[PDB]
A paper describes a structure:
The structure was refined to 2.1 Å resolution with a free R factor of 24.9% (crystallographic R factor is 20.9%). NN206 forms a bilobal fold: (1) the N-terminal lobe, which consists of one α-helix and six β-strands, forming three β-sheets (β1/β3/β4/β5, β2/β5/β4, and β1/β6/β5); (2) the C-terminal lobe, which is exclusively α-helical, consisting of a five-helix bundle. Here we report the crystal structure of an N-terminal fragment of MtaLonA determined at a 2.1 Å resolution, demonstrating that it is similar to the structures of both EcLon and MacLon NTDs, but not to that of BsLon. The residues of MtaLonA NTD with the pronounced CSPs are part of the interaction interface located mainly at helix α1, loop L1, L2, L3, and β-sheet β2/β5/β4, which consist primarily of hydrophobic residues and are decorated by a number of polar residues. By analyzing the NTD of MtaLonA interactions with damaged Ig2, the scrambled lysozyme, and Sul20 peptide, we conclude that these binding events are mediated by two hydrophobic patches, which comprise (1) L10, V14, I15, P22, V23, and M85 (termed hpI in the following); (2) M75, L77, P78, and L82 (termed hpII). In contrast, the structures of the N-terminal fragments from MtaLon, EcLon, and MacLon show that the N- and C-lobes are joined together via a short linker.
The Lon AAA+ protease (LonA) is a ubiquitous ATP-dependent proteolytic machine, which selectively degrades damaged proteins or native proteins carrying exposed motifs (degrons). Substrate recognition of LonA is thought to be mediated by its NTD.
Residue numbers in the entry:
A (entry chain A): 0 to 206
B (entry chain B): 0 to 113, 115 to 206
The structure:
């Protein structure tokens, strides 16, 4: 449990969940200025999804409250003037207190993952998640996923990482992934991911 | 049933369907230049949804093939340098052959709407009005004004009914794009009804 003052990168149509390392294309000037503060300092940064992908310059009201604390590990330039930035999402963050300035900066609380005392149900849910995800991948039609990613999921045995990684790979809406991010209770989080997977499997099987 | 060369406006996260008049916020320079060509000419324009909302400078491959032919009705220069444009979409368009230039321009074929098996269509229409009333009743997120819902209930044109419901529903771009691309009327009505019934099951699930 920490409190950090970090620059904030708004994500138009993406939710980053902890335990994921992903490249983020960064086109907007204010997002770029947030990246260079991070790289010039401790490389810590907040990533927060927008409520509306079409908003060009989001204010605090345009952003969800919860995001992730991430590490900026390296940045690259592309033929375009955008920056591809590799980010390591570490933990959920409640990003509340935005500070006036030329770009988005805020103080937020970074949250530990609390393991429930009902470990037995969680262990069953973990096995139900891996089974449901394997069928989701087998019966999905538009899903991009490499073999090594699929074996990582099946080899993960922590529930918190398993839920977060599955939610990252699945093709759910921002609002649906945002709710996974905001469910701190682990068994409720596992049951939401499983409900969404079963829902899509039902829909896949009809056709 | 004509082929026209018009400027094209890419939409990041919106699908426009015929029979709708909607505001379009226009931030990108190429989108702004495409609007003013329309305003300086016959005010006709193509609106095409992007496949990926995060793409800043879409190429033809970044766009769906089908869009709408619309009339630019008014433009509001906003303080942040954006253009709010009111557009009335009037017909489906297959936007195929994009033209070299500083912004998106393309030739596309505009398709008029022509009621098949009137017996099934009538059943689907009545089933649609009922499902929509409950969809509106059992969502939890949707903002519809009274005049809009009574417009739905009084409409007896099937094409207008399907397109208007798809406009109001909170479905993804890909799902609404599928409504746009179903030119055969009975298949379109059966898709809209399936999506509403699908959502009705999930709403009562809680």
């Amino acid at each position: 449990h920490m409190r950090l003052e970090l620059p904030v990168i708004p994500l138009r149509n993406t939710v980053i969940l902890p335990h994921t390392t992903t490249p983020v294309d960064v086109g907007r000037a204010k997002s770029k200025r947030a990246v260079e503060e991070a790289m010039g300092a401790d490389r810590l940064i907040f990533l927060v999804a927008q409520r509306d992908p079409e908003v060009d310059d989001p204010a605090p009201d345009d952003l969800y409250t919860w995001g992730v604390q991430a590490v900026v590990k390296q940045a690259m330039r592309l033929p375009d003037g955008t920056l591809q930035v590799m980010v390591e999402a570490r933990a959920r963050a409640q990003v509340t207190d935005y500070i006036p300035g030329p770009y988005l900066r805020a103080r937020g609380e970074v949250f530990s993952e609390i393991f429930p005392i009902d470990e037995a149900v969680v262990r069953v849910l973990v096995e139900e998640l891996k089974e449901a995800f394997e069928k989701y991948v087998a019966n999905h039609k538009s899903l991009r996923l490499d073999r090594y990613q699929l074996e990582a999921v099946k080899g993960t045995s922590d529930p918190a990482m398993l839920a977060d990684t599955i939610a990252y790979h699945a093709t759910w809406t921002v609002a649906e992934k945002q709710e996974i991010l905001e469910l701190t209770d682990l068994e409720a989080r596992l049951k939401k991911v499983l409900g969404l997977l079963s829902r899509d499997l039902e829909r896949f099987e009809l056709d």
